[PDB]
Amino acid sequence: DLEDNWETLNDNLKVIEKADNAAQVKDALTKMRAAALDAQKATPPKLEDKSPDSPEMKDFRHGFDILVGQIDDALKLANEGKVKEAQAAAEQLKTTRNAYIQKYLILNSSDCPKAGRHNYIFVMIPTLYSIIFVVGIFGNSLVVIVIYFYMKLKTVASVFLLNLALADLCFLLTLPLWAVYTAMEYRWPFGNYLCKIASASVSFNLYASVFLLTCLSIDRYLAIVHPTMLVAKVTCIIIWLLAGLASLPAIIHRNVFFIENTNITVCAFHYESTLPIGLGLTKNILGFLFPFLIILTSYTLIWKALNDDIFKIIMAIVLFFFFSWIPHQIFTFLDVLIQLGIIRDCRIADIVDTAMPITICIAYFNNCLNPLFYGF
Numbered sequence: 001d002l003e004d005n006w007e008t009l010n011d012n013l014k015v016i017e018k019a020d021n022a023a024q025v026k027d028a029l030t031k032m033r034a035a036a037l038d039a040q041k042a043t044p045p046k047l048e049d050k051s052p053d054s055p056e057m058k059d060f061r062h063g064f065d066i067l068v069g070q071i072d073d074a075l076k077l078a079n080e081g082k083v084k085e086a087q088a089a090a091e092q093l094k095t096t097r098n099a100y101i102q103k104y105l106i107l108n109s110s111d112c113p114k115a116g117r118h119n120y121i122f123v124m125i126p127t128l129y130s131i132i133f134v135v136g137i138f139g140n141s142l143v144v145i146v147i148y149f150y151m152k153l154k155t156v157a158s159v160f161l162l163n164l165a166l167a168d169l170c171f172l173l174t175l176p177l178w179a180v181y182t183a184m185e186y187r188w189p190f191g192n193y194l195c196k197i198a199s200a201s202v203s204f205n206l207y208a209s210v211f212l213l214t215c216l217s218i219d220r221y222l223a224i225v226h227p228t229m230l231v232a233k234v235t236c237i238i239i240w241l242l243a244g245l246a247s248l249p250a251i252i253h254r255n256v257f258f259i260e261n262t263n264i265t266v267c268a269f270h271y272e273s274t275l276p277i278g279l280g281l282t283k284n285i286l287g288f289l290f291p292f293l294i295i296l297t298s299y300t301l302i303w304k305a306l307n308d309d310i311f312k313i314i315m316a317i318v319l320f321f322f323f324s325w326i327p328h329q330i331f332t333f334l335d336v337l338i339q340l341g342i343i344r345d346c347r348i349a350d351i352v353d354t355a356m357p358i359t360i361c362i363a364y365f366n367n368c369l370n371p372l373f374y375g376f
Protein backbone atom coordinates (compact mmCIF):
# COMPACT_ATOMS: atom_id res chain seq x y z
CA ASP A 1 0.00 0.00 0.00
CA LEU A 2 2.01 2.97 -1.37
CA GLU A 3 -0.65 5.68 -0.77
CA ASP A 4 -0.94 4.62 2.91
CA ASN A 5 2.87 4.97 3.33
CA TRP A 6 2.75 8.62 2.22
CA GLU A 7 -0.25 9.09 4.54
CA THR A 8 1.76 7.50 7.38
CA LEU A 9 4.77 9.77 6.66
CA ASN A 10 2.77 12.99 6.13
CA ASP A 11 0.81 12.29 9.35
CA ASN A 12 3.94 11.42 11.39
CA LEU A 13 5.90 14.37 9.92
CA LYS A 14 3.19 16.64 11.41
CA VAL A 15 3.70 15.01 14.87
CA ILE A 16 7.37 16.16 14.66
CA GLU A 17 6.24 19.76 13.92
CA LYS A 18 4.21 19.87 17.19
CA ALA A 19 6.78 17.92 19.28
CA ASP A 20 8.26 18.65 22.72
CA ASN A 21 10.94 16.08 23.70
CA ALA A 22 13.32 13.61 22.00
CA ALA A 23 11.24 10.52 22.88
CA GLN A 24 8.16 11.84 21.02
CA VAL A 25 10.43 12.69 18.05
CA LYS A 26 12.08 9.23 17.88
CA ASP A 27 8.74 7.39 18.30
CA ALA A 28 7.42 9.16 15.17
CA LEU A 29 10.75 8.85 13.27
CA THR A 30 11.05 5.07 13.87
CA LYS A 31 7.57 4.55 12.32
CA MET A 32 8.45 6.72 9.27
CA ARG A 33 11.57 4.61 8.65
CA ALA A 34 9.44 1.44 8.39
CA ALA A 35 6.95 2.99 5.92
CA ALA A 36 9.77 4.09 3.56
CA LEU A 37 11.16 0.52 3.36
CA ASP A 38 7.63 -0.88 2.89
CA ALA A 39 7.12 1.75 0.14
CA GLN A 40 10.50 0.95 -1.47
CA LYS A 41 9.26 -2.62 -2.17
CA ALA A 42 6.14 -1.33 -3.97
CA THR A 43 5.49 -0.37 -7.59
CA PRO A 44 4.53 3.27 -8.32
CA PRO A 45 1.58 4.38 -10.49
CA LYS A 46 3.37 5.21 -13.78
CA LEU A 47 5.68 2.12 -13.87
CA GLU A 48 3.25 -0.72 -14.66
CA ASP A 49 4.73 -2.40 -17.77
CA LYS A 50 8.34 -2.29 -16.49
CA SER A 51 10.27 -4.89 -14.51
CA PRO A 52 11.35 -4.65 -10.83
CA ASP A 53 14.92 -4.65 -12.26
CA SER A 54 14.29 -1.75 -14.73
CA PRO A 55 16.31 1.51 -14.54
CA GLU A 56 12.95 3.23 -13.85
CA MET A 57 12.34 0.99 -10.79
CA LYS A 58 16.01 1.20 -9.73
CA ASP A 59 15.43 4.99 -9.62
CA PHE A 60 12.17 4.50 -7.65
CA ARG A 61 13.97 2.58 -4.90
CA HIS A 62 16.98 4.93 -4.87
CA GLY A 63 14.58 7.81 -4.07
CA PHE A 64 13.48 5.82 -1.00
CA ASP A 65 17.15 5.26 -0.02
CA ILE A 66 17.56 9.07 -0.09
CA LEU A 67 14.41 9.12 2.10
CA VAL A 68 15.66 6.47 4.57
CA GLY A 69 19.18 8.01 4.62
CA GLN A 70 17.59 11.36 5.56
CA ILE A 71 15.46 9.65 8.26
CA ASP A 72 18.67 8.04 9.62
CA ASP A 73 20.59 11.28 10.34
CA ALA A 74 17.44 12.86 11.87
CA LEU A 75 17.19 9.79 14.15
CA LYS A 76 20.90 10.25 15.04
CA LEU A 77 19.93 13.65 16.50
CA ALA A 78 16.87 12.21 18.31
CA ASN A 79 19.06 9.46 19.88
CA GLU A 80 21.52 12.10 21.14
CA GLY A 81 18.56 14.15 22.51
CA LYS A 82 18.49 17.08 20.07
CA VAL A 83 14.83 17.94 19.42
CA LYS A 84 14.98 21.37 17.73
CA GLU A 85 17.86 20.17 15.53
CA ALA A 86 15.99 16.96 14.54
CA GLN A 87 12.74 18.87 13.77
CA ALA A 88 14.62 20.71 10.98
CA ALA A 89 16.03 17.52 9.40
CA ALA A 90 12.51 16.02 9.13
CA GLU A 91 11.44 18.92 6.86
CA GLN A 92 13.85 17.57 4.17
CA LEU A 93 11.19 14.92 3.38
CA LYS A 94 8.96 17.68 1.95
CA THR A 95 11.37 18.16 -1.01
CA THR A 96 11.36 14.36 -1.52
CA ARG A 97 7.55 14.36 -1.39
CA ASN A 98 7.40 17.24 -3.91
CA ALA A 99 10.00 15.48 -6.11
CA TYR A 100 7.97 12.28 -5.93
CA ILE A 101 4.55 13.75 -6.93
CA GLN A 102 6.09 15.48 -9.99
CA LYS A 103 7.67 12.25 -11.28
CA TYR A 104 4.88 9.65 -10.69
CA LEU A 105 1.63 11.37 -9.63
CA ILE A 106 0.97 14.06 -12.31
CA LEU A 107 -1.06 13.14 -15.43
CA ASN A 108 0.49 14.60 -18.63
CA SER A 109 -1.58 17.63 -19.65
CA SER A 110 -3.67 17.38 -22.83
CA ASP A 111 -3.83 20.29 -25.27
CA CYS A 112 -7.56 20.67 -24.43
CA PRO A 113 -7.73 20.27 -20.60
CA LYS A 114 -11.07 21.97 -19.83
CA ALA A 115 -12.90 20.11 -22.67
CA GLY A 116 -15.99 18.46 -21.12
CA ARG A 117 -16.20 20.70 -18.03
CA HIS A 118 -19.79 21.99 -18.11
CA ASN A 119 -21.96 22.76 -15.08
CA TYR A 120 -25.04 20.77 -16.15
CA ILE A 121 -22.85 17.63 -16.54
CA PHE A 122 -22.02 17.84 -12.78
CA VAL A 123 -25.75 17.94 -11.80
CA MET A 124 -27.35 15.85 -14.61
CA ILE A 125 -24.93 12.89 -14.47
CA PRO A 126 -24.96 12.34 -10.69
CA THR A 127 -28.77 12.62 -10.37
CA LEU A 128 -29.04 10.12 -13.26
CA TYR A 129 -26.50 7.83 -11.49
CA SER A 130 -28.64 8.24 -8.32
CA ILE A 131 -31.86 7.13 -10.09
CA ILE A 132 -30.17 4.19 -11.86
CA PHE A 133 -28.73 3.24 -8.44
CA VAL A 134 -31.70 3.12 -6.04
CA VAL A 135 -34.25 1.86 -8.61
CA GLY A 136 -31.76 -0.83 -9.68
CA ILE A 137 -31.17 -1.87 -6.05
CA PHE A 138 -34.87 -2.42 -5.26
CA GLY A 139 -35.34 -3.62 -8.88
CA ASN A 140 -32.68 -6.35 -9.01
CA SER A 141 -33.23 -7.16 -5.29
CA LEU A 142 -36.84 -8.12 -6.10
CA VAL A 143 -35.69 -10.26 -9.06
CA VAL A 144 -33.24 -12.46 -7.05
CA ILE A 145 -35.79 -13.19 -4.29
CA VAL A 146 -38.62 -14.10 -6.72
CA ILE A 147 -36.19 -16.51 -8.45
CA TYR A 148 -35.70 -18.29 -5.09
CA PHE A 149 -39.49 -18.18 -4.41
CA TYR A 150 -41.47 -18.58 -7.68
CA MET A 151 -39.10 -19.95 -10.37
CA LYS A 152 -37.11 -21.89 -7.72
CA LEU A 153 -34.21 -22.40 -10.21
CA LYS A 154 -36.46 -24.63 -12.34
CA THR A 155 -35.10 -23.85 -15.84
CA VAL A 156 -31.65 -23.47 -17.41
CA ALA A 157 -32.74 -19.93 -18.42
CA SER A 158 -33.64 -19.13 -14.79
CA VAL A 159 -30.07 -19.60 -13.48
CA PHE A 160 -28.43 -17.25 -16.04
CA LEU A 161 -31.08 -14.62 -15.19
CA LEU A 162 -30.35 -15.10 -11.45
CA ASN A 163 -26.65 -14.48 -12.20
CA LEU A 164 -27.43 -11.38 -14.29
CA ALA A 165 -29.36 -9.98 -11.31
CA LEU A 166 -26.31 -10.55 -9.06
CA ALA A 167 -23.91 -9.09 -11.65
CA ASP A 168 -26.18 -6.00 -11.78
CA LEU A 169 -26.05 -5.70 -7.97
CA CYS A 170 -22.20 -5.89 -7.96
CA PHE A 171 -22.12 -2.97 -10.41
CA LEU A 172 -24.76 -0.88 -8.62
CA LEU A 173 -22.97 -0.91 -5.22
CA THR A 174 -20.06 1.07 -6.75
CA LEU A 175 -22.16 3.72 -8.63
CA PRO A 176 -22.35 6.17 -5.66
CA LEU A 177 -18.56 6.55 -6.07
CA TRP A 178 -18.91 7.78 -9.67
CA ALA A 179 -22.03 9.84 -8.94
CA VAL A 180 -20.15 11.97 -6.38
CA TYR A 181 -16.94 11.88 -8.49
CA THR A 182 -18.88 13.68 -11.24
CA ALA A 183 -20.78 15.79 -8.65
CA MET A 184 -17.40 16.96 -7.25
CA GLU A 185 -16.55 18.22 -10.80
CA TYR A 186 -14.41 15.14 -11.50
CA ARG A 187 -12.30 14.62 -8.37
CA TRP A 188 -11.84 11.35 -6.48
CA PRO A 189 -11.65 11.44 -2.65
CA PHE A 190 -11.93 7.67 -2.01
CA GLY A 191 -8.27 6.71 -2.64
CA ASN A 192 -6.38 4.32 -4.92
CA TYR A 193 -7.86 0.92 -3.93
CA LEU A 194 -11.42 1.95 -4.76
CA CYS A 195 -10.18 3.63 -7.96
CA LYS A 196 -9.29 0.10 -9.17
CA ILE A 197 -12.14 -2.10 -7.85
CA ALA A 198 -14.87 0.41 -8.78
CA SER A 199 -13.36 0.61 -12.31
CA ALA A 200 -12.97 -3.17 -12.46
CA SER A 201 -16.68 -3.47 -11.46
CA VAL A 202 -18.05 -1.59 -14.52
CA SER A 203 -15.80 -3.45 -16.98
CA PHE A 204 -17.07 -6.62 -15.23
CA ASN A 205 -20.71 -5.67 -15.91
CA LEU A 206 -19.94 -5.33 -19.64
CA TYR A 207 -18.15 -8.70 -20.00
CA ALA A 208 -20.37 -10.57 -17.53
CA SER A 209 -23.62 -9.32 -19.14
CA VAL A 210 -22.62 -10.00 -22.74
CA PHE A 211 -21.34 -13.52 -21.88
CA LEU A 212 -24.54 -14.11 -19.84
CA LEU A 213 -26.76 -12.86 -22.72
CA THR A 214 -24.79 -15.05 -25.17
CA CYS A 215 -25.71 -18.02 -22.93
CA LEU A 216 -29.37 -16.94 -22.73
CA SER A 217 -29.38 -16.85 -26.56
CA ILE A 218 -27.58 -20.19 -26.99
CA ASP A 219 -30.00 -21.60 -24.37
CA ARG A 220 -33.16 -20.41 -26.15
CA TYR A 221 -31.72 -21.61 -29.49
CA LEU A 222 -31.07 -25.12 -28.13
CA ALA A 223 -34.24 -25.13 -25.96
CA ILE A 224 -36.68 -24.74 -28.91
CA VAL A 225 -34.74 -25.45 -32.17
CA HIS A 226 -33.17 -28.73 -30.94
CA PRO A 227 -35.30 -29.81 -27.93
CA THR A 228 -28.12 -29.44 -18.38
CA MET A 229 -28.64 -27.68 -15.01
CA LEU A 230 -25.19 -28.70 -13.72
CA VAL A 231 -23.42 -27.48 -16.90
CA ALA A 232 -25.30 -24.13 -16.72
CA LYS A 233 -23.96 -23.51 -13.19
CA VAL A 234 -20.45 -24.60 -14.30
CA THR A 235 -20.74 -21.97 -17.07
CA CYS A 236 -21.97 -19.15 -14.77
CA ILE A 237 -18.99 -19.48 -12.36
CA ILE A 238 -16.64 -19.64 -15.40
CA ILE A 239 -18.29 -16.42 -16.76
CA TRP A 240 -17.36 -14.61 -13.49
CA LEU A 241 -13.74 -15.83 -13.93
CA LEU A 242 -13.43 -14.51 -17.52
CA ALA A 243 -15.19 -11.20 -16.66
CA GLY A 244 -12.83 -10.74 -13.69
CA LEU A 245 -9.81 -11.56 -15.86
CA ALA A 246 -11.16 -9.28 -18.65
CA SER A 247 -11.47 -6.46 -16.03
CA LEU A 248 -7.83 -7.03 -14.91
CA PRO A 249 -6.67 -3.96 -16.95
CA ALA A 250 -8.81 -1.81 -14.60
CA ILE A 251 -6.80 -3.15 -11.61
CA ILE A 252 -3.38 -2.61 -13.30
CA HIS A 253 -3.55 0.82 -15.00
CA ARG A 254 -6.10 2.80 -12.90
CA ASN A 255 -4.53 5.21 -10.39
CA VAL A 256 -5.46 8.35 -8.51
CA PHE A 257 -3.42 11.11 -10.19
CA PHE A 258 -3.14 14.87 -9.66
CA ILE A 259 -3.40 17.09 -12.78
CA GLU A 260 -1.35 20.18 -13.79
CA ASN A 261 -0.05 20.53 -10.18
CA THR A 262 -3.40 21.13 -8.44
CA ASN A 263 -5.27 19.97 -5.34
CA ILE A 264 -7.94 17.97 -7.25
CA THR A 265 -7.22 14.25 -7.79
CA VAL A 266 -8.52 12.28 -10.80
CA CYS A 267 -9.05 8.45 -11.08
CA ALA A 268 -7.78 7.88 -14.63
CA PHE A 269 -6.40 5.11 -16.83
CA HIS A 270 -2.68 5.15 -17.64
CA TYR A 271 -2.02 4.31 -21.30
CA GLU A 272 1.71 5.05 -21.83
CA SER A 273 4.42 0.59 -30.05
CA THR A 274 0.93 2.14 -29.59
CA LEU A 275 -0.48 -1.34 -28.81
CA PRO A 276 -2.91 0.18 -26.21
CA ILE A 277 -5.11 0.97 -29.26
CA GLY A 278 -4.06 -2.28 -31.02
CA LEU A 279 -5.22 -4.36 -28.03
CA GLY A 280 -7.70 -1.69 -26.88
CA LEU A 281 -9.71 -2.80 -29.95
CA THR A 282 -9.65 -6.53 -28.97
CA LYS A 283 -12.26 -5.65 -26.29
CA ASN A 284 -14.65 -4.43 -29.03
CA ILE A 285 -14.20 -7.58 -31.24
CA LEU A 286 -14.58 -10.04 -28.33
CA GLY A 287 -17.30 -7.94 -26.68
CA PHE A 288 -19.29 -7.13 -29.83
CA LEU A 289 -18.40 -9.31 -32.85
CA PHE A 290 -18.05 -12.70 -31.11
CA PRO A 291 -21.36 -12.49 -29.15
CA PHE A 292 -23.30 -10.23 -31.61
CA LEU A 293 -22.93 -12.64 -34.56
CA ILE A 294 -23.61 -15.69 -32.35
CA ILE A 295 -26.58 -13.92 -30.68
CA LEU A 296 -28.07 -12.62 -33.97
CA THR A 297 -27.69 -16.03 -35.66
CA SER A 298 -29.16 -17.60 -32.48
CA TYR A 299 -32.38 -15.52 -32.44
CA THR A 300 -32.93 -14.95 -36.19
CA LEU A 301 -33.58 -18.71 -36.36
CA ILE A 302 -35.74 -19.17 -33.22
CA TRP A 303 -37.67 -15.89 -33.69
CA LYS A 304 -38.50 -17.05 -37.23
CA ALA A 305 -39.23 -20.62 -36.00
CA LEU A 306 -41.34 -19.87 -32.88
CA ASN A 307 -40.57 -21.23 -24.49
CA ASP A 308 -42.46 -18.03 -25.40
CA ASP A 309 -42.54 -16.16 -22.04
CA ILE A 310 -38.81 -16.37 -21.26
CA PHE A 311 -37.98 -15.60 -24.93
CA LYS A 312 -39.91 -12.29 -24.66
CA ILE A 313 -37.87 -10.97 -21.69
CA ILE A 314 -34.46 -12.15 -23.01
CA MET A 315 -35.14 -10.64 -26.45
CA ALA A 316 -36.06 -7.31 -24.81
CA ILE A 317 -32.98 -7.34 -22.56
CA VAL A 318 -30.69 -8.31 -25.46
CA LEU A 319 -32.03 -5.81 -28.02
CA PHE A 320 -31.95 -2.85 -25.60
CA PHE A 321 -28.48 -3.72 -24.22
CA PHE A 322 -26.84 -3.68 -27.66
CA PHE A 323 -28.80 -0.63 -28.91
CA SER A 324 -27.60 1.21 -25.77
CA TRP A 325 -23.90 0.58 -26.60
CA ILE A 326 -24.09 2.04 -30.15
CA PRO A 327 -24.15 5.72 -28.99
CA HIS A 328 -21.13 5.17 -26.72
CA GLN A 329 -19.07 2.98 -29.08
CA ILE A 330 -19.38 5.84 -31.62
CA PHE A 331 -18.04 8.45 -29.16
CA THR A 332 -15.35 6.22 -27.59
CA PHE A 333 -14.13 5.51 -31.12
CA LEU A 334 -14.07 9.30 -31.68
CA ASP A 335 -12.19 9.72 -28.37
CA VAL A 336 -9.47 7.32 -29.62
CA LEU A 337 -9.02 9.62 -32.67
CA ILE A 338 -8.59 12.55 -30.21
CA GLN A 339 -6.09 10.63 -28.00
CA LEU A 340 -4.01 9.53 -31.02
CA GLY A 341 -3.61 13.13 -32.32
CA ILE A 342 -5.58 12.44 -35.53
CA ILE A 343 -8.14 15.16 -34.72
CA ARG A 344 -6.99 18.41 -33.02
CA ASP A 345 -9.91 20.87 -32.70
CA CYS A 346 -10.69 21.37 -28.99
CA ARG A 347 -14.31 22.26 -29.80
CA ILE A 348 -14.55 18.70 -31.22
CA ALA A 349 -12.80 17.33 -28.10
CA ASP A 350 -15.31 19.28 -25.93
CA ILE A 351 -18.24 17.65 -27.80
CA VAL A 352 -16.83 14.12 -27.35
CA ASP A 353 -15.78 14.68 -23.72
CA THR A 354 -19.18 16.12 -22.73
CA ALA A 355 -21.01 13.40 -24.74
CA MET A 356 -19.06 10.59 -23.02
CA PRO A 357 -20.74 10.69 -19.53
CA ILE A 358 -24.18 10.73 -21.17
CA THR A 359 -23.41 7.83 -23.51
CA ILE A 360 -22.01 5.90 -20.49
CA CYS A 361 -25.31 6.37 -18.57
CA ILE A 362 -27.21 4.86 -21.51
CA ALA A 363 -24.84 1.86 -21.68
CA TYR A 364 -25.36 1.13 -17.96
CA PHE A 365 -29.04 2.25 -17.74
CA ASN A 366 -29.85 -1.42 -18.46
CA ASN A 367 -28.78 -2.35 -14.90
CA CYS A 368 -31.89 -0.66 -13.43
CA LEU A 369 -34.44 -1.36 -16.21
CA ASN A 370 -33.52 -5.05 -16.80
CA PRO A 371 -35.72 -5.86 -13.73
CA LEU A 372 -38.62 -3.99 -15.40
CA PHE A 373 -38.40 -6.39 -18.39
CA TYR A 374 -39.01 -9.32 -15.99
CA GLY A 375 -42.40 -7.81 -15.02
CA PHE A 376 -43.79 -7.97 -18.56
Ligand SMILES: CCCc1nc(C(C)(C)O)c(C(=O)O)n1Cc1ccc(-c2ccccc2-c2nnn[nH]2)cc1
Residues within 6 Å of the ligand: 178, 182, 198, 199, 200, 202, 203, 206, 249, 250, 254, 267, 269, 356, 357, 360, 364
Ligand atom coordinates in the same frame (compact mmCIF):
# COMPACT_ATOMS: atom_id res chain seq x y z
C1 LIG B 1 -20.13 3.20 -15.39
C2 LIG B 1 -18.75 3.80 -15.42
C3 LIG B 1 -18.90 5.13 -14.74
C4 LIG B 1 -17.77 6.10 -15.16
N1 LIG B 1 -18.06 7.33 -15.59
C5 LIG B 1 -16.92 7.93 -15.88
C6 LIG B 1 -16.86 9.39 -16.41
C7 LIG B 1 -16.41 9.39 -17.89
C8 LIG B 1 -15.92 10.24 -15.54
O1 LIG B 1 -18.17 9.97 -16.31
C9 LIG B 1 -15.92 7.08 -15.63
C10 LIG B 1 -14.61 7.33 -15.79
O2 LIG B 1 -14.12 7.40 -16.94
O3 LIG B 1 -13.87 7.48 -14.79
N2 LIG B 1 -16.43 5.92 -15.18
C11 LIG B 1 -15.61 4.77 -14.79
C12 LIG B 1 -15.38 3.85 -15.83
C13 LIG B 1 -15.85 3.97 -17.15
C14 LIG B 1 -15.56 2.97 -18.10
C15 LIG B 1 -14.80 1.85 -17.75
C16 LIG B 1 -14.52 0.85 -18.69
C17 LIG B 1 -15.61 0.25 -19.34
C18 LIG B 1 -15.42 -0.76 -20.29
C19 LIG B 1 -14.14 -1.18 -20.59
C20 LIG B 1 -13.04 -0.61 -19.96
C21 LIG B 1 -13.22 0.41 -19.01
C22 LIG B 1 -12.13 0.92 -18.42
N3 LIG B 1 -11.37 0.29 -17.55
N4 LIG B 1 -10.53 1.05 -17.24
N5 LIG B 1 -10.70 2.20 -17.86
N6 LIG B 1 -11.66 2.15 -18.57
C23 LIG B 1 -14.34 1.73 -16.44
C24 LIG B 1 -14.62 2.73 -15.50
